Curated annotation (Swiss-Prot), chain A:
Protein name: Gamma-aminobutyric acid receptor subunit beta-2
Residue window of the full protein shown: 31 to 128 of 512
Binding-site positions, histamine: Y91
Glycosylation sites: N2, N74
Known disease link: Epileptic encephalopathy, infantile or early childhood, 2: A form of epileptic encephalopathy, a heterogeneous group of severe childhood onset epilepsies characterized by refractory seizures, neurodevelopmental impairment, and poor prognosis. Development is normal prior to seizure onset, after which cognitive and motor delays become apparent. IECEE2 is an autosomal dominant condition with variable age at seizure onset, ranging from early infancy to 6 years.
Subcellular location: Postsynaptic cell membrane; Cell membrane; Cytoplasmic vesicle membrane
Summary of subunit composition and partner proteins: Heteropentamer, formed by a combination of alpha (GABRA1-6), beta (GABRB1-3), gamma (GABRG1-3), delta (GABRD), epsilon (GABRE), rho (GABRR1-3), pi (GABRP) and theta (GABRQ) chains, each subunit exhibiting distinct physiological and pharmacological properties. Interacts with UBQLN1. May interact with KIF21B. Identified in a complex of 720 kDa composed of LHFPL4, NLGN2, GABRA1, GABRB2, GABRG2 and GABRB3.
Domain notes: The extracellular domain contributes to synaptic contact formation. GABAARs subunits share a common topological structure: a peptide sequence made up of a long extracellular N-terminal, four transmembrane domains, intracellular or cytoplasmic domain located between the third and the fourth transmembrane domains.
Effect of M49T: In IECEE2; uncertain significance
Purpose of the protein: Beta subunit of the heteropentameric ligand-gated chloride channel gated by gamma-aminobutyric acid (GABA), a major inhibitory neurotransmitter in the brain. GABA-gated chloride channels, also named GABA(A) receptors (GABAAR), consist of five subunits arranged around a central pore and contain GABA active binding site(s) located at the alpha and beta subunit interface(s). When activated by GABA, GABAARs selectively allow the flow of chloride anions across the cell membrane down their electrochemical gradient.
Swiss-Prot record, chain C:
Included range, full protein: 37 to 130 of 456
Keywords, alphabetical: Cell membrane, Chloride, Chloride channel, Cytoplasmic vesicle, Disease variant, Disulfide bond, Epilepsy, Glycoprotein, Ion channel, Ion transport, Ligand-gated ion channel, Membrane, Postsynaptic cell membrane, Receptor, Signal, Synapse, Transmembrane, Transmembrane helix, Transport
Compartments where located: Postsynaptic cell membrane; Cell membrane; Cytoplasmic vesicle membrane
Transmembrane as UniProt keyword: yes
Residues involved in 4-aminobutanoate binding: R58
Name of protein: Gamma-aminobutyric acid receptor subunit alpha-1
Entry-listed glycosylation sites: N2
Domain observations: The extracellular domain contributes to synaptic contact formation.
Amino acid sequence: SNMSLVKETVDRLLKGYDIRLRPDFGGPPVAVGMNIDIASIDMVSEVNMDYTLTMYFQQAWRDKRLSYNVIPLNLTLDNRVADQLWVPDTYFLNDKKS
Amino acid sequence: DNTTVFTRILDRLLDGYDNRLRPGLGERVTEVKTDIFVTSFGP
Amino acid sequence: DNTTVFTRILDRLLDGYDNRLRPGLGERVTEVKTDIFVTSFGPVSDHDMEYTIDVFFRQSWKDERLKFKGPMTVLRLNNLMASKIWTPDTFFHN
Ligand SMILES: *[C@@H]1O[C@H](CO)[C@@H](O[C@@H]2O[C@H](CO)[C@@H](O[C@@H]3O[C@H](CO)[C@@H](O)[C@H](O)[C@@H]3O)[C@H](O)[C@H]2NC(C)=O)[C@H](O)[C@H]1NC(C)=O
Ligand SMILES: *[C@@H]1O[C@H](CO)[C@@H](O)[C@H](O)[C@H]1NC(C)=O
C-alpha cells in the first residue's frame, strides 16, 4: 500500500541519521532562507521599552540526507519528527521572553 | 485474565503504527469532526 | 561522504566517556578559563535592589579524553553534544 511505502521511505531516511552534524558538515555552508508572516504586534510599552510580536517564522534549507525518489508527493510529517532532524540554531538577539 | 487479553489487543493495535503519517496519507483526505462546549466564557 | 567519518569520530569520542568525572580527576586541577560579553545591561530595578544583565557567558577547559585526528581541526558541534560531556557547574553567587 501507499501508506506502507511512505513509512518505509521515512524509516529509511531517519536510519543512520546523525543529528549532531549539519548538512554538508565538511564542505560549504548551508543556505537557510527565512520567511516571516507577522500575525500581530500586541503591545508597545514605553515603561519596559519592549514590544510583543506574534509571527509565523519559517525557515527553508536543503538537506541531502532527507532526499527520496520513490514517492512523488511532498511529505508532511507530524511536528514531533523535528526532534530527530537537524534544524538551524536561530535565535533572536534582542528578545526578552518568547 | 481480562487485563491480559486487553493488553494483547492494545499491543497488536500499535504494532507497526507510524504516528508521523495521517490516516490515508496519499489515498484520501482526513475528515476531523469538531465540537466545542464552552464551560465558561471568561472576562 | 564526510558524514560517516565524522559520525565515527564522534562515536569514538563518546565511547568510554564518563560525564560524572571532571577532566584530570587524579593528577590535575581543572582550569576553567571564563569570559563574559554583556550584550545589554538591563534596567536596574531600584525597588527590588536587583538588576538584569544579558550575557554571553563563555567557558573553556582542557579535556584530554576528547582528542581526535580528522580532516577538520575544530569540531563546531551542536548544543546537544554538551550534555554528554563534563561541563563545569558555574552558578552565580548572588
Ligand atoms: C529547549 O529546547 C529543546 C530543543 O528545542 C528541547 O529539547 C526537547 O525536549 C523534549 C522533551 O524533553 C524531547 O522530547 C523527548 O524525546 C525523548 C526521546 O529522546 C522521549 O523519550 C521523551 O518522551 C520526549 O518526547 C526532545 O527530543 C528534545 N529535542 C531535542 C532536539 O533535544 C527542550 O525540551 C527545551 N526545554 C525547555 C525547558 O523548553
Ligand atoms: C511540492 O512543492 C513544490 C513547491 O511548492 C511544488 O512545485 C510541487 O508541485 C509540490 N509537489 C506536489 C506533488 O504537489
